[PDB]
Copies of this chain bind each other. A is one copy, B any other.
Amino acid sequence: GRSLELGAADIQDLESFEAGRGALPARAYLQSDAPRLSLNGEWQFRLSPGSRVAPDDGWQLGEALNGFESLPVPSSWPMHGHGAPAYTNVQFPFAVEPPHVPEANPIGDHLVVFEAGPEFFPHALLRFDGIESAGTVWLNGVELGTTRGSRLAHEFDVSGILEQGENTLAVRVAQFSAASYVEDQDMWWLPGIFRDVTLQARPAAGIDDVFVHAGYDHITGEGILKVEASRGGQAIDAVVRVPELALELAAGTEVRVPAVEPWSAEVPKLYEAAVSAAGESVALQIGFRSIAIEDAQFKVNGRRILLRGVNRHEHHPRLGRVVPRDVVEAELRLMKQHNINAIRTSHYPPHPQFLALADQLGFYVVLECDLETHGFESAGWAQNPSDDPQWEDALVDRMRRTVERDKNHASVVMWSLGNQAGTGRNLAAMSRWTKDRDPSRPIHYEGDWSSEHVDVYSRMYASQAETALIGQGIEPALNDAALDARRRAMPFVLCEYVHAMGNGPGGMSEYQALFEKYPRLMGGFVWEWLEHGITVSTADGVDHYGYGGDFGEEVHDGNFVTDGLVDADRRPRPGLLDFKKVIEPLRIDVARDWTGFTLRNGQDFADTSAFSFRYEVEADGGALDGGTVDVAPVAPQSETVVELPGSVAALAAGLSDGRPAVLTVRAVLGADSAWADAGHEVAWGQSVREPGAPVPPAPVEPVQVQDSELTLGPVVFSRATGMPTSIGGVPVEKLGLTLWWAPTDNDLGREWGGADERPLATQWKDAGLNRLHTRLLGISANPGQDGGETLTVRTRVSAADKQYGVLVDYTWSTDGETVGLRTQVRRDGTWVNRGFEVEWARIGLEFVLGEETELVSWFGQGPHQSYPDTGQGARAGWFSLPLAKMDVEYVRPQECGARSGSRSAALQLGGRTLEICGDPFALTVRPYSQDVLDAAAHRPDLKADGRTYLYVDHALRGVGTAACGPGVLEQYRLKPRDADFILTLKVRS
């Protein structure tokens, strides 16, 4: 007997190493006057759980369809109730045995009917800009071919198949195929026809492909122009016209434009052009720019540039991989509004419409091929497609389609072979093909650290320390002298750094100082631009983002998909506010005497003519003075000192010697730009006259003693515990020391190095920092002033089963009006647990009040959160926010919302108002406890309990980027130590 299994034919095709069959030559995405009909819209769709059960019932004819239902196209079909999204980071969701596919393989059959007028005859084609991951296509029942390369475009000739009038298009899509083994990016698995489908006419004497070459000679200022045009792979006679430059030339000839204005991310000058043959005309946007590497520097138009980058995935919280155009435009505007100038298309080519937007708004684009075999690493890279000769044609095809589609856009300054694909022969073949095809753009690929087949040295998450050694050209040498000589002559780029997951990222300033200091350093791209949160609702109607595991995944990686500077709806996270400041292209150093400010132009090409420089002096009441000062344009990388009007300094000299006041100088847009309105803030700097130290109240009030209570002015103490039970009428339910916070995503990551690789969160739990207990040692009153007394309460704080502890003494004093509180902390015993030193999250106090807080106001850093190694974007001033807005809406709740650098605070408990002053402290106010915060997996898990949780911290730990990359830097760590700090409290009813 012979075979009896079902569907072996479909599965054999899915297991194919080949690049897909039947498609036209890969070419550029071109704006053409040829008639076109978009087939996007409502299609019919049927889902089958595997190939062996996918019906073979002639559905491709579209007649008598059973089981089909409406579905929009383009779409990621798990976003519409057909199956569910599934998130994995590295691990494959199927057994690793290439090229084989699992039995559980969603098969989607798509069908649409459309009308083809006489414009699409004799010749036309069908274009698919993306199918995840394996498509088969029929038109009127005849097979056109298949598609491989989920984020790449495929075109099929329908001449003689397309019929006048009604036509029926059928597409079978398999989620998984052999191609899934090379599409293992860290993101959601989402099958579907997720990009545009277009019917295009191909008139005779038309234009199939165009290759624009627009160089710039920064010495002469000339533009070097050659525009290739071809039909069916052969060069053709066509006319290229550039009206603005008074140019008419034949395609295929190189000319020298006497003077062009060069293209850059800062000044994205574009010239409108058209290349036309008898039967077709293509409209182009030409940006003249040349890219070169010399003296170990990445240079554009003769100047080293600094990349202020992000890694941009394509994701939408409700449509999956389908990003509507208005979302693309909005988010690119938002990037510019935060001083971003570079984008890495992690880790695949974007929607083809993205390229023209990058050209127009101004971004340096690393365009990356759709290739990642990350899941093979855990097996020592055994069977890695990148080094398997059977995969060469498939991988070269991926690179070719990547290069051909976008080769005409000035914004693309580097080609990238892929991401986390190891090293191998097929990667070298992709580089060789690209170098031969387009030598005008350097090659990028991080996976091969030897850098044998690339033109820049790229790394991800290298420490600040190692980056400094690379910046100096003193990194350790490669074992191969020839390769080392090559790599040392390359400029260095961080294709991913300062992982922006949750609270953070920390340590951005230390990287940036190196970027500004060492020319070899090209800059870096933050990981990543957006969180891939998927919107989920409840019968309550409450909306929250879901992540890995929230969709039934047998195998997932949790919330590592929510690791962005903005949430899935492009709401900024605090890290973006800080990032904007870190990469600001102008440096403003306000003089302490308020006479002027130093201004350095950090841009690479533009001067300062685009900015209006404005100043304001704000005080306790409000603004005292302000205006605008004229600055002679400052050349790029140049420096000057700007005088402020004499009234500003005189105003500084006239203050009371205790009055706080802030002078802020800002650089805003003088006029509307393509990405923001006039007045938009780009850079800023401050100088502060800080408020004098607060006066401790004279201890003139005595301590009144009762059986179970002590009273000292407005404070009533529980005589049993020694802690206050109310201050001026507001109930105090608990007061104690804090040393711990609800772990951030970073605290949950392993900090490599040392024999201790427990995450900091685990070190804390093992140490008991989350379950502190306090023992009362004694209560004592002492002589103060004029019959007054101070009340000292001695305690020891520790945790169950631990011998180490801390002695805490609270000294209370009052004049009847304000309350003086002095806290003294002293280590008792060695703070070591499980053989390693315990580290602290904080040294602070937790006040639990028995009433809710409606409003929180403070003088310090704001408006958003700030921790020791973050908060660059938090400026000095007076701020006020409702309680809900003090919080930060991370998908997985975690420590957040602390306002470091606070000098004074005011909580409003309805009619009463609680004020806190003292030496600089961090402020946090929450309607729920830390234990509720730590336990919560999603924001709906957080509930108010009618209380106010007030945190006053004398010291804080940094947050770092330990979820992926460096942990907290040394200077921001918090090791157990003795400490003392003073506060003052007061209630206004």
A223-231, A655-663, A714-722, A864-872: which one contacts chain B? Answer: A714-722
Q: A803 touches which one: B50, B96, B775, B802 (CB < 8 A)?
A: B96
Taking the complex as formed, is A1 at the interface, i.e. its CB lies under 8 A from any CB of chain B? yes
By a CB distance below 8 angstroms, the chain B residues around A52 are 720-721, 776
Contact with B along A764-780 (1 / 0, CB 8 A): 00000001011110111
- How far, in angstroms, from A103 to B789 measured CA to CA in the complex? 26
Smallest CB-CB separation from A382: which chain B residue? B803
Q: Is the CB of B100 within 8 A of A800?
A: no
Known contacts A97-B796, A102-B773; decide if A3 and B778 are in contact (CB<8 Å).
Answer: yes
Which residues 768-806 of A sit at the B interface, judged by CB distance below 8 A? 771, 773-776, 778-783, 789, 796, 798-803, 805
Complex copy number for this chain: 2
Q: Is the CB of A4 within 8 A of B779?
A: yes
The chain A residues found within 8 Å of chain B, CB to CB, are: 1-7, 50, 52-53, 90-97, 100, 102-104, 375, 378-379, 382-383, 554-555, 703, 705, 708, 710, 719-722, 771, 773-776, 778-783, 789, 796, 798-803, 805
Q: Is the CB of A801 within 8 A of B96?
A: yes
- How far, in angstroms, from A705 to B783 measured CA to CA in the complex? 102
By a CB distance below 8 angstroms, the chain B residues around A92 are 800-801
By a CB distance below 8 angstroms, the chain B residues around A379 are 803
Q: Is the CB of A378 within 8 A of B5?
A: no
Q: Is the CB of A721 within 8 A of B803?
A: no
- How far, in angstroms, from A803 to B703 measured CA to CA in the complex? 74
Q: Is the CB of A801 within 8 A of B91?
A: yes
- How far, in angstroms, from A796 to B775 measured CA to CA in the complex? 62
- How far, in angstroms, from A801 to B800 measured CA to CA in the complex? 41
The 4 closest A-B pairs by CB, nearest first: A1-B781, A95-B798, A91-B801, A4-B779
A93, chain B: closest CB distance, angstroms = 5
Smallest CB-CB separation from A7: which chain B residue? B720
Q: Is the CB of A555 within 8 A of B720?
A: no
Q: Is the CB of B95 within 8 A of A789?
A: no
By a CB distance below 8 angstroms, the chain B residues around A555 are 771, 800-801
- How far, in angstroms, from A719 to B103 measured CA to CA in the complex? 13
Q: Is the CB of B4 within 8 A of A781?
A: yes
Q: A780 touches which one: B2, B719, B779 (CB < 8 A)?
A: B2
By a CB distance below 8 angstroms, the chain B residues around A722 are 5
Q: Is the CB of A97 within 8 A of B805?
A: yes
- How far, in angstroms, from A428 to B719 measured CA to CA in the complex? 45
By a CB distance below 8 angstroms, the chain B residues around A773 are 94-95, 102-104
Smallest CB-CB separation from A378: which chain B residue? B801
A788, chain B: closest CB distance, angstroms = 12
Q: Is the CB of A705 within 8 A of B800?
A: no
Smallest CB-CB separation from A91: which chain B residue? B801
A818, chain B: closest CB distance, angstroms = 22
Most chain B beta-carbon neighbours within 10 Å: one of A1, A94, A379: A1
Q: Is the CB of B95 within 8 A of A800?
A: yes
- How far, in angstroms, from A781 to B774 measured CA to CA in the complex? 76
A420, chain B: closest CB distance, angstroms = 15
Q: Is the CB of B783 within 8 A of A103?
A: no
Smallest CB-CB separation from A722: which chain B residue? B5
- How far, in angstroms, from A538 to B104 measured CA to CA in the complex? 41
A936, chain B: closest CB distance, angstroms = 19
- How far, in angstroms, from A781 to B4 measured CA to CA in the complex? 8
A752, chain B: closest CB distance, angstroms = 16
- How far, in angstroms, from A989 to B360 measured CA to CA in the complex? 78
By a CB distance below 8 angstroms, the chain B residues around A721 are 52, 103
Smallest CB-CB separation from A719: which chain B residue? B6
By a CB distance below 8 angstroms, the chain B residues around A780 are 1-4
Q: Is the CB of B800 within 8 A of A94?
A: yes
Given contacts A3-B780, A52-B776, A103-B775, 7 further A-B contacts (CB under 8 A): A1-B782, A4-B781, A5-B719, A5-B779, A97-B805, A555-B771, A555-B801
- How far, in angstroms, from A581 to B654 measured CA to CA in the complex? 98
Known contacts A1-B789, A52-B720, A771-B554; decide if A95 and B799 are in contact (CB<8 Å).
Answer: yes
Q: Is the CB of B95 within 8 A of A776?
A: no
